[PDB]
Amino acid sequence: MEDVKQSVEKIIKDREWVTFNDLLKYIPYPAPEVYDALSQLIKENKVGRRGRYFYYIKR
Numbered sequence: 001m002e003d004v005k006q007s008v009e010k011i012i013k014d015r016e017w018v019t020f021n022d023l024l025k026y027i028p029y030p031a032p033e034v035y036d037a038l039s040q041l042i043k044e045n046k047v048g049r050r051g052r053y054f055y056y057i058k059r
Contacts, residue, residue, distance in 0.1 A: 002037065004027065004034045005040050005041065008041060009046060009047065012054055012056045013056050016056055017050070017053045019052050020034075
């Protein structure tokens with residue numbers, strides 16, 4: 001239960017590849033929140049930054 005992260009990780013998993021601004025359309029949480037939450041999943045090798053969009057890293 002990591003607040004933004006729960007939504008962030010889900011959307012990446014659901015959409016496969018999503019832009020930062022795309023997250024903002026589904027996530028009503030301020031960008032600084034989701035951005036940090038994102039870097040958590042990225043750190044956990046779940047999400048990867050691929051230019052302007054983020055992809056769910058294959059498991």
